[PDB]
Structures are given as structure tokens and as C-alpha cells.
């Protein structure tokens, strides 16, 4: 059954500092004891992140633009987002993608969906069990169907502060959705915790559609569909050049944006992080 949220309040659009996040393993190649300049879609350092906080009845989950790729990050205790809707118009006019976590597994289908105008995760809030994913009722012209492993998912109103910080990287690349995941164990209350963090690949998804937009699916925490306190974040992947440092283990320890300041492009030039006092010829203009 497609129903909507009722107590929909006004959005946030809070700006954040993207300080040292969004770095990931782009290929499936092992390199170590090295230093590697390359260009791909990336998060610009210290850039603006639009934050979507969930305060008492703010259902801050519109259809959000995607265009090449996005960053989902969320300081979570109750995991109030467990779903995303990929596509152009999302409805059963064209082929769209739903990736949701029904508290049992991650179920993924790419079909023409009869979407709700405000889809949500039906959860009894003080009991903590997800009852139904009130997202689509019918699916048509299905092209790919995925079911993850079954796992028990904490879906209650968690008290205390946010213990989980997932990082997500979503890329529409030539029929393929690439889904990457990172994690920080956190204990935070406020804006956006700074820190270096990496991601790893999980998914190559031959869904095969146009994805210009995406829809964030909140979890409805109701005892009438309701909330609990969380926040989540939207960033943009941009086609720029990074130089990345691999340890002996082939683990990213350190990387540098080229676009930040002329200091940074200099570091990209000489292929080092330690630059002597002097004057250095760099790129012309």
C-alpha cells in the first residue's frame, strides 16, 4: 500500500565541511610501496555538504539530484535511512531501481515501479521491528533482482548518541551501479565529524537504466508515520585528479586533492608530500 508521510515538515539544507572524507579504492588492482596520481570522480576536500537532519517531524527526504554520483553519509543509531530509489522519474514510466533493507536482508530490484509519492519503512517505534517497506506495490518489466544475505537488523529508537557512521559511494557507470561502503565507529552529537576515512567496493550492479535523480527513503518511526533523531548527508563526485599513497599493505593511508590551493597542485606535481623550501615551476595558465 502506497501511503505518504502526514506530518511532513520543512527541510534543513544545512551546510557542512567535507573535510577528509570520500576516498576510495577505484580499481581492483593491488599496488603497494608507491604513490599514484590518477583522475576520477571524487569528493572535493573541505567542500560543502548539504545536511538533512531529522528533528521531531522533519521528513527531509525529497527527490535529490544525482547527475554522476553521490555521497551518502549518516551518523546513525537507528539507521533511519535504509533505502534509495534510483532512476530519472522513478515511477512506472521508465525503469527505476529500488535498493532497500527490509530489516531481514537487502532486497534490490530494477523494474517499472508503482512508487509511493512519499515511500517509507513501516516500523513500530518503541517495539523495533520493521513491518513493511511501503515503497512500491507492483513491479513491471523487471531487469535485475537481488536479495542479500539474511541478517537481523536493529530498527528501534536507539537512545544515546550515534554509534555508527556509514559512508556510501554510488556511481552510475555504463549500465552499472557501483556501491562502495566505509565505516567509522563514532560517538558524536553534532555537525559533521572530520577525519580521514576510506571505502571499499562491494557491488557491480548491471541495472541498465538512466539515473539522473535519487530518492532518499527514511524509516517511519511511529507508535501516522513518525521520526526519531538522525541526520544524513549528500555530496557530489567530481572528475578531478588525486594522488594517493599506498603503504606496504596496499592500504590508503594518505591522499591529496590537486584543486585546493597552489600548495596542493605542487604536491601533485613533484609526487611527494614533503617539499623543500624553494621556488618550483608548476603548470602554466
Amino acid at each position: 500500500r502506497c501511503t505518504t508521510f502526514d506530518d511532513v515538515q520543512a527541510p534543513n539544507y544545512t551546510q557542512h565541511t567535507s573535510s577528509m572524507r570520500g576516498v576510495y579504492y577505484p580499481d581492483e588492482i593491488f599496488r603497494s610501496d608507491t604513490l599514484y596520481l590518477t583522475q576520477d570522480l571524487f569528493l572535493p576536500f573541505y567542500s560543502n555538504v548539504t545536511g538533512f537532519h531529522t528533528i521531531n517531524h522533519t521528513f527531509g527526504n525529497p527527490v535529490i539530484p544525482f547527475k554522476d554520483g553521490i555521497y551518502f553519509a549518516a551518523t546513525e543509531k537507528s539507521n533511519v535511512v535504509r533505502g534509495w530509489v534510483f532512476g530519472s522519474t522513478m515511477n512506472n514510466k521508465s525503469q527505476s531501481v529500488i535498493i532497500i533493507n527490509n530489516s531481514t536482508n537487502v532486497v534490490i530490484r530494477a523494474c517499472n515501479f508503482e512508487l509511493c509519492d512519499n515511500p517509507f519503512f513501516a516500523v513500530s517505534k518503541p517495539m523495533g521491528t520493521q513491518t513493511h517497506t511501503m515503497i512500491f506495490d507492483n513491479a513491471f518489466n523487471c531487469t535485475f533482482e537481488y536479495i542479500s544475505d539474511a541478517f537481523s537488523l536493529d530498527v528501534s529508537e536507539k537512545s544515546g548518541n550515534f554509534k555508527h557512521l556509514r559512508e556510501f559511494v554510488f556511481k552510475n557507470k555504463d549500465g552499472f551501479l557501483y556501491v562502495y561502503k566505509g565505516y567509522q565507529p563514532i560517538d558524536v552529537v553534532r555537525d559533521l565529524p572530520s577525519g580521514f576515512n576510506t571505502l571499499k567496493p562491494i557491488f557491480k550492479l548491471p541495472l541498465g537504466i538512466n539515473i539522473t535523480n535519487f530518492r532518499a527513503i527514511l524509516t517511519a518511526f511511529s507508535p501516522i508515520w513518525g521520526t526519531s533523531a538522525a541526520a544524513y548527508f549528500v555530496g557530489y563526485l567530481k572528475p578531478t585528479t588525486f594522488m594517493l599513497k599506498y603503504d606496504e599493505n596496499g592500504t590508503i593511508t594518505d591522499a591529496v586533492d590537486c584543486s585546493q590551493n597552489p600548495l596542493a597542485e605542487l604536491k601533485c606535481s613533484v609526487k611527494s608530500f614533503e617539499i623543500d623550501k624553494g621556488i618550483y615551476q608548476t603548470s602554466n595558465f
Binding site: 588492482i29 593491488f30 608507491t34
Partner: protein, 283 residues
């Protein structure tokens, strides 16, 4: 240069085997005018359940496509023939099957597996649900079916049989269990290459030799030896500080091999001169 001698081809564990026990050993097959378009795709059509068996009379490919099956979305077209119609499951061969029941071409076909179903299809009095066409207004074109029991007339008159110049096109095969070999039923499946592929050719890791290789996507000459490079679980193969490939995780057994060059180098000749000697020591 030292010329390599050896071949290390390794593939992963073979992906999804085609249900040959449930398509090429299935319980429900039609006649030959109406082949069952058993759609199989994204699979490994290896014939391996069936090529090493004693059910099958023909093994006729155009099950040697255990080697060379790698084609498009192949519908595993399946059917039941007369004993004399066993030989005609081939390209051309202008008999009852190719003219009126189902014409076969000589490009997009796999293997004819014609196995004995005397105690599955036939009775002591005759299986009369299986019919063949022996007359039609025009012979068939390749991969075409004709299910219609057409009120046949050999000169174009409108026909309601059994009136004048009116025949029935579908003749019964006559599947007995107490007849000779020529009127025994074979359940047969023939591939129509309309995506499935074949199995994986996989062999030894001949370590510490100058060999050729072909892993799952990586070719060349090399010297293979195990390594201590801690790959991550998502990692296909490794590259050096420069951009050449030097290490690979084995696609079947996940061993982290090292890849070295095969060998080469320069040669000097050391000599005291032609006026002193004619032996030299090479370097």
C-alpha cells in the same frame, strides 16, 4: 631471449551449469514440427552430464561442443524423432524433418543428443500423440516451425478432408516397443544459437619456469612463483611501482603468484684475438 615452454591457463570455478538433467533429460518433449524453445541464458552449456554417458546415439555437432560452445541466447530446442528420422537431425539432409518438420542450417547449431526413450515414449501398441509432417505447400526455411494441422491440398483447391484431393499432413511416427530400430522414439535436443557458453579449460601452475600463460583476463609470458603480497578480497591482480603487471591472485584457488619476466639480456664475447686463439668465452 629464452623461448618459453609451457602453458598455464587457469579459469575460476565454472559458473552456473545448464540444467542438462532437466532440459536434455526432461520429461516433456514435443514432436519435430513444433520444437520446444527451451530458453537458457547466462549459463554454462557444457554437455558434461551427457557426453560421458551411454544414452545417446548421435553426438553429432555442427557432444563435441563441450569444447566450442560460446554463443548468444540459445534456446535448447527439444523434440522427439522417429528412428529413421534420427540421421536427418543435421544441416540440409532433405528428408522428413528438414523439408516439412524443422529445417536445420549449417552455421548456428550445436549438438544432436538423440537418446533412447523406448520405455518412456513408446507403448506396445503405439504412441500416437507424436506426429510428423510429410506434405506441406512449400518446404521449410531454417529454424521455422509449423504446428498447424493444415487441411492439405496438392493443387491449391479449398480443402475439407476426406473430400477430393485432401490429405492430412501430420502422419503418426508409430512408436512401438515391439518393433525394429527404425521406428523407435528418440527424445532429442538441438541447440538453436539465437547467453550460454562452454566450460573452463584449466591446467597446472608450472612454477619456476619460462612459460606462456593465460589467466582469467591476463596473458603473456612469465615466471610463476608464490608471494607474500597481502591482496585484499576485492583485488584481481597486482602491479608494480611502475604500471606493469607483476602479481595475480589465481582465479580458481586464490594463490598470490608473482609474475617475473621470462628472461633476456645481453651477450659479450671475450677474446684474445684471432692471431692468438680461436676459442672465446661468452658472457
Amino acid at each position: 631471449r629464452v623461448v618459453p615452454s609451457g602453458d598455464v591457463v587457469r579459469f575460476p570455478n565454472i559458473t552456473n551449469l545448464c540444467p542438462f538433467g532437466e532440459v536434455f533429460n526432461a520429461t516433456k518433449f514435443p514432436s519435430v514440427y513444433a520444437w520446444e524453445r527451451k530458453k537458457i541464458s547466462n549459463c554454462v552449456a557444457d554437455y558434461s552430464v551427457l557426453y560421458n554417458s551411454t544414452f545417446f546415439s548421435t553426438f553429432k555437432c555442427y557432444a563435441t561442443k563441450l569444447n566450442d560452445l560460446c554463443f548468444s541466447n540459445v534456446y535448447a530446442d527439444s523434440f522427439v524423432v522417429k528412428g529413421d528420422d534420427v540421421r536427418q537431425i543435421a544441416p540440409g539432409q532433405t528428408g522428413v524433418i528438414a523439408d516439412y518438420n524443422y529445417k536445420l542450417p549449417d552455421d548456428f547449431m550445436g549438438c544432436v543428443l538423440a537418446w533412447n526413450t523406448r520405455n518412456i515414449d513408446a507403448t506396445s501398441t503405439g504412441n500416437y500423440n507424436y506426429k510428423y509432417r510429410y506434405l506441406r505447400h512449400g518446404k521449410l526455411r531454417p529454424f521455422e516451425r509449423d504446428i498447424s494441422n493444415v487441411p492439405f491440398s496438392p493443387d491449391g483447391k479449398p480443402c475439407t478432408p476426406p473430400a477430393l484431393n485432401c490429405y492430412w499432413p501430420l502422419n503418426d511416427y508409430g512408436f512401438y516397443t515391439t518393433t525394429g530400430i527404425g521406428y523407435q522414439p528418440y527424445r532429442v535436443v538441438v541447440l538453436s544459437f539465437e547467453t550460454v557458453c562452454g566450460p573452463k579449460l584449466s591446467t597446472d601452475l608450472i612454477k619456476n619456469q619460462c612459460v606462456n600463460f593465460n589467466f582469467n583476463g591476463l596473458t603473456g609470458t612469465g615466471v610463476l612463483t608464490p608471494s607474500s603480497k597481502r591482496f585484499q578480497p576485492f583485488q584481481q591482480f597486482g602491479r608494480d611501482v611502475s604500471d606493469f603487471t607483476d602479481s595475480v591472485r589465481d582465479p580458481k584457488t586464490s594463490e598470490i603468484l608473482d609474475i617475473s619476466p621470462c628472461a633476456f639480456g645481453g651477450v659479450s664475447v671475450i677474446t684474445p684475438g684471432t692471431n692468438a686463439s680461436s676459442e672465446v668465452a661468452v658472457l
